[PDB]
Design an enzyme around this catalytic site. Structure first.
Site: not given
Ligand SMILES: CC1(n2cnc3cnc4[nH]ccc4c32)CCN(S(C)(=O)=O)CC1
Length: 279
Positions: A20, A128
């Protein structure tokens, strides 16, 4: 001796598994004997400390066969997880098409749903869910493999209000998440519908939710991309049926994408719907 305590000195970096903006996961060998016989592990590190600590505490306490196993910590802190050598559906599906037919795809779908329904019963929203975060344990089993955005929903509240949203995976997100930054279990259901589309397209880059939506709404809108996405969704436009996907599977997918969260299918209903198609 604590078996969940991993010493930094023995933790040997191999390669990146993903990242990320603020965290990264690497394949490492934990090699205390120094001879390259030690166990391979997945190691999550910051590139924010409080957030990773919360993720550790969530994952350490999740026990489900479709949820990746916590192994320990390295202490600043790192999360140590089991490494799944087949990788995510993103690596696995394109390389194994000949091996993986619709029936196995639907079995993976059921497993993701079971993992997610376990998570929801613990009052968590994931935020997510995508094919890149679904790991392949074997040809017959998958696991949810990352919990970096996972948040607790407050008791007797139906949603989590997000503050940090810079790097939202917008093309996997329900309209309420895009418009109001409110995150429901139903919002995870929407994301699962998109994830299912990926599974059915074998994670082909050219059929990805992003590539496809940007074809629908236009790729050159910059900061106006999300408003145009929302607008296109308001109009009732959705990702199209994947090639070779039966209308009955596509319809289950469409129930994930109802505009109002209240009108969406649930993970329980999806599991019933897939199990019915299997036998
Ligand atoms: C789940 C992951 N991954 C890919 N292959 C893996 C293999 N084994 C893994 N164990 C834990 C995670 C993990 C793997 C891929 C995606 N990321 S991320 C959210 O940083 O983009 C984490 C690692």
């Amino acid at each position: 001796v604590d078996p969940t305590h991993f010493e930094k000195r023995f933790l040997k970096r191999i390669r990146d598994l993903g990242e990320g903006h603020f965290g990264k996961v690497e394949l490492c060998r934990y090699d205390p004997e120094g001879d390259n016989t030690g166990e391979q592990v997945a190691v999550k590190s910051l590139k924010h400390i409080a957030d990773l600590k919360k993720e550790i505490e969530i994952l350490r306490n999740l026990y489900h066969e479709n949820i990746v196993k916590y192994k320990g910590i390295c202490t600043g802190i790192k999360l140590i997880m089991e490494f799944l050598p087949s990788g995510s559906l993103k690596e696995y599906l394109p390389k194994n098409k000949n091996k993986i037919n619709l029936k196995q795809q639907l079995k993976y779908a059921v497993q993701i749903c079971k993992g997610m329904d376990y998570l929801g019963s613990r009052q968590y929203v994931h935020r997510d869910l995508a094919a890149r975060n679904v790991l392949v344990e074997s040809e017959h089993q998958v696991k949810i493999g990352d919990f970096g955005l996972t948040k607790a929903i407050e008791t007797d509240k139906e949603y989590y209000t997000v503050k940090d949203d810079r790097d939202s995976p917008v093309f996997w997100y329900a309209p309420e998440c895009l418009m109001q930054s409110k995150f429901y279990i139903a919002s995870d259901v929407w994301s699962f519908g998109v994830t299912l589309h990926e599974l059915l397209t074998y994670c082909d880059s050219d059929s990805s939710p992003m590539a496809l939506f940007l074809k629908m709404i236009g790729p050159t809108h910059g900061q106006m991309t999300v408003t145009r996405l929302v607008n296109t969704l308001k109009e009732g436009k959705r990702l199209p049926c994947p090639p070779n996907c039966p209308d009955e599977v596509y319809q289950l997918m469409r129930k994930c994408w109802e505009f109002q969260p209240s009108n969406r299918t649930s993970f329980q209903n999806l599991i019933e719907g897939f199990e019915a198609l299997l036998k």
